[PDB]
Ligand binder design. Structure first.
Ligand SMILES: NC(=O)CC[C@H](N)C(=O)O
Length: 415
């Protein structure tokens, strides 16, 4: 099956990218290649990232509008509220687990005001311009007029504001009744065309992923040397993802529904493998909906609401990774975490996970939110970037798994 072919090709692409990076490093790596050759060698991964970032905007906006407009107000008050509560609770639990694992395992064993960071988050939630929000985000800087904060708009898609606006606009379209059906159809057709584009991009995804991994491994001085530093961090991220996906989320599924959660996961394994390979829940959306509807019997409306929304708003893996990274930093640099700082980390991780793009680059783009809110050195992300190619795949797997289990839980709640 071509879906299984895509999964196989993407996993083999990750493995072959690791092998190619190791081989290139054995031949001298960047030092031997020189910028001229290195840029061309790494270019295909950049091209894949550009292709996915191009489709983020229309994909997210149209999917969210359609999902929000897929339920009537009679169901929005019950299904919508419960879905929002489930997403919030799951993200909070993922962030708490990340904090706990990072503090316990201590990965690092051996500037913007917090108020300004939260105000910037609130401003990004409510964008002042929809067109500007498509490629810019609010950010506060300081001028010694005593520091006085002045707010600029800096490069970077405002996924959070676009998500909020899309959900609100879908709800408004549902409110309109027959008058809004034309726009619902328009946005559904646009989303379907964007999914066709995503399916086409996923066929280039193998080569792009291979070259991206190879470049990210050639960039570092030596795998055996960088992994010496980052082994505890990688272990914390992967262990937290495994605990959340195999124990916590299944435990919630079993508590709110007396069905077997792993039987549910068996019917979405293929979505999970595609998520691991591509590391883009947005690209995993179609197969995910197909599996939840057919293999697990989730009702059509339940899926069409929960999954397109969850894929952008709900990301337990992204939240857990960002939280474990925010705790890993502050240990590379000798800062300390108290209860207030931990709670700030949790809240900022929730907001950042909501504001992440469902693609390979989602995590680090918004980890800066947490780092600024905890006043941690932002430049340290350069280290995480050297390994993000590995953690991000588990992040995406958990992000899609949360969506699937939420769909099942809501389907049982509606029964
Ligand atoms: N590192 C992350 O979690 C970013 C988002 C993730 N790649 C996803 O598709 O869900």
């Amino acid at each position: 099956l071509r879906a299984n072919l895509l999964v196989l090709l993407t996993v083999v692409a990750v493995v072959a990218g690791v092998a190619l990076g190791l081989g290139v490093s054995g031949a001298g790596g960047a030092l031997a290649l020189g910028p001229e050759r290195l840029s061309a060698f790494v270019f295909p991964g950049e091209l894949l990232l550009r292709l996915l970032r191009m489709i983020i905007l229309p994909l997210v906006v149209c999917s969210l509008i359609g999902g929000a407009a897929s339920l009537d107000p009679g169901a929005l008050g019950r299904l919508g509220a419960w879905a929002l509560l489930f997403f919030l609770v799951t993200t909070l639990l993922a962030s708490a687990l990340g904090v706990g694992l990072a503090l316990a395992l201590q990965p690092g064993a051996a500037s913007k005001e917090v108020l300004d960071s939260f105000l910037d988050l609130a401003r990004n939630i409510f964008p002042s311009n929809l067109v500007s929000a498509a490629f810019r985000s609010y950010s506060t800087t300081y001028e010694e007029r005593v520091k006085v904060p002045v707010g600029q708009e800096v490069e970077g898609m405002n996924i959070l504001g676009l998500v909020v606006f899309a959900i609100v606009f879908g709800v408004a379209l549902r409110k309109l009744g027959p008058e809004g059906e034309l726009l619902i159809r328009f946005f559904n057709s646009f989303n379907e065309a964007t999914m066709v584009l995503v399916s086409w991009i996923m066929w280039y995804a193998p080569v792009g992923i291979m070259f991206l991994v190879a470049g990210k491994i050639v960039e570092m001085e030596d795998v055996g040397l960088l992994f010496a530093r980052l082994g505890k961090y990688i272990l914390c991220c992967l262990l937290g993802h495994a605990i959340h996906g195999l124990l916590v989320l299944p435990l919630i599924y079993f508590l709110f529904t007396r069905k077997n959660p792993y039987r549910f996961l068996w019917g979405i394994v293929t979505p999970l493998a595609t998520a691991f390979g591509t590391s883009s829940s947005s690209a995993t959306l179609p197969l995910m909906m197909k599996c939840v509807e057919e293999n697990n019997g989730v009702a059509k409306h339940i899926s069409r609401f929960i999954l397109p929304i969850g894929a952008t708003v709900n990301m337990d893996g992204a939240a857990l990774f960002q939280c474990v990274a925010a705790v890993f930093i502050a240990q590379l640099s000798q800062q300390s975490l108290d209860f207030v700082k931990i709670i700030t980390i949790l809240v900022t991780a929730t907001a950042s996970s909501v504001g992440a793009a469902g693609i390979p680059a989602g995590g680090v783009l918004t980890l800066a939110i947490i780092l600024e809110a905890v006043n941690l050195p932002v430049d340290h992300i350069s280290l995480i970037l050297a390994v993000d190619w590995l953690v991000d795949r588990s992040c995406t797997v958990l992000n899609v798994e949360g969506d699937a289990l939420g769909a099942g839980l809501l389907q049982n709640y509606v029964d």
